[model samples]
Target: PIHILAFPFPAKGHINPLLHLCNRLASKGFKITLITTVSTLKSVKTSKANGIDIESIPDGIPQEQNHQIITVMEMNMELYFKQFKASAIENTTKLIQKLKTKNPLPKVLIYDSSMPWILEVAHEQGLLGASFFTQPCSVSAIYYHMLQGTIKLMVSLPYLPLLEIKDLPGVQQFEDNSEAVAELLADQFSNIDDVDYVLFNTFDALEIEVVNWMGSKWPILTVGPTAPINYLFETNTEVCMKWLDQREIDTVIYVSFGSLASLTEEQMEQVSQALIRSNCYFLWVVREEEENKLPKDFKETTSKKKGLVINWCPQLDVLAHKSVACFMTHCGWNSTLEALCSGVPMICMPQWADQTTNAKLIEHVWKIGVGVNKSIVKREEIEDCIRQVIESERGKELKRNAIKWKELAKEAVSEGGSSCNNIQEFSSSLL
Candidate 1:
């Protein structure tokens, strides 16, 4: 069997896509070794797949301070990234050498796009390297232009809608860390031309023009909507499903900001009040730590009938439920893809990073959702967005678009489809 070693940045959003990709490759008869940080491995639940092996390397963080990178990022992001890069490079190099002695010697090193340095290590070790991007092609295209100094206030790519500077990733929010984050994102393209393959977690039809645009310059391949059926966090499936069983079809709104994003107390209050005032049956996933941010008595009053506030739930399952009319999301790419795949309309309230760009795609490019104005996070604005998605006449159009995309998503991964063909071609090339 051909052996492929895959590494991902040790975050849920980053690791999960790569993991799912690895699983797909393994199912195609490739021997897969998936690497995680010492801490991340503890959190990830690996399946007992025959051809897949799980391994680990140190993340340069102390064992005693086994905090998630998101929590550590809250303190000093630059320092953490520097340390992680340095240690990850050193340890990954050593691990590759160690694996060289084993049977079916690893021939390919597939790594997360965030760690461009891995391509250098792969080449040095005489292994073909593939960069795996978890984000969409449109966002990656914008970053490519930004790195080349061609980005503008009003950006116009081939088939994508005109994007304002505020719509770009890491823009319009987090001014303090924006430069650092932008530098990191831009660095993904620094070694792009050197890699053996550029693989994206997206399908062709989703961003045809942008995908073709990037493909013109590189050996680009789209093999995704690579979401896993399982989750790292234990899902409150029973409670969520039990409650949704009684709700009317296309009536409930599902709200979540994904795993990493933390909203301000004021923003939380606005969302809470909006849900109550919208008089819409809702299910919101407020992380346990941020539960205190909600207005006092918010849960006590609303949880009885109007809403269900839980720490976590199986988002894909909830989105697929007949009762779930729309998703009020932070517009994280993974969550956005899940909503799209499940045929659920979206009320996009983007927070930061690629979420802003994803929100723009949902509202403008894809026409599958409406976005709340970033400048206004008031209860009225939030409620208006909720009502627009769940009650307005335009909502019917959004739902129709959502279902269209959902069918395309399924087709992309089905047998004889674009994504499946790409994966098959990629595997055959290695053979």
Candidate 2:
């Protein structure tokens, strides 16, 4: 069996997709060892599959201080980035050396694209390297062009619609500290041309043109919608599932902003008001830390039959529930793929990073959702978008497109399908 070492950046978003990929490879009879940070190791939940093992290396940041990078304040942003890379490089080198002593030693290192330097470490250790992109190809293509100094205000890439500056990832934050943030994004491509393989957490049929564009440039392999069945956070599964079981089909709207991306108190208030006003059965996932941002007595005041707000739940299950009519999401790639896979239309409220780009794909490219254009969307707009997705003729069209994508997503991962073929070819190459 081919032995592969998989490493993801510590955050849940990055970790989940990579783990899903690792799980897939493990199922294919590969022996997989997953490397995570000491701080993040405790949070990971892996499959019970026999071929996969979990390991950890120090990231230099103290466990307590190693918060999610998004939530880290401005003062510590660069400091944490630098610290993580320096420590990760040194410790990872040692880990590779140690792993070399094992029988049937690992031959490849598949790492998150954010840490471009990992390729260097893998090369130094005489291991083949593959860069795994957690984001979709469309967003990565934009970044590729941006890094090439080719992206303009009205961007035109192959098979994608025209995009304005606002549609770009991190556009809102660009004004304040673009140099630092842009530098970080630029680093993703720093060693792109040097890797043995480039893997994306997306399937070909979903973003064929952009995927082709990327493939034309590198030995790119698409092997996802790597949607994991495991949860990093404990899920309120029974409650949310039971709540959905009681609701009517195509009547409930599921809302979640993902693990990162917190809404302000005012924005949460608006979302609260919109859910109440829309008069739809809603299931909302508000993280424990952000629950305080909701209106005081909001949970108690909202009728039990009208809404169910929990700290965390099995999002994939909830999205796939029969009662789920639509999803109001932050357009995180994982969430977007989950909703798409579940055949649920989206009401996009993109926050930051590649979310705006994902929202653009959901709305314009895929025609499976509508997006709220404002940075902090108003209650009325939120209500209207929700109503439109759940009540309008266009909503029916969106649902059709969503279901189509869902079928395609399944097909892509099924036997002899695009993603399955890609993964097979990739594995055979290693042999």
| Highest TM-score scorer | 2
The clash tally of candidate 1 reads 0
lDDT by residue (tens digit), candidate 2, 218-323: 8888888877446655788889899899988999988999887788898888889889989998989998888888888887776465999898888878888899
Model 2: lDDT equals 0.83
Give each prediction's root-mean-square deviation over alpha carbons.
Answer: 2.3, 2.2
Off by over 4 Å in 1: 45-51, 62-66, 157-159, 374-376
What total of clashing residue pairs does each candidate reach? 0, 0
Model 2 Cα RMSD, Å?
2.2
The residue pairs that clash in candidate 2, if any, are none
Candidate 2 Cα outliers beyond 4 Å, as residue runs? 45-51, 62-66, 174-177, 301-303
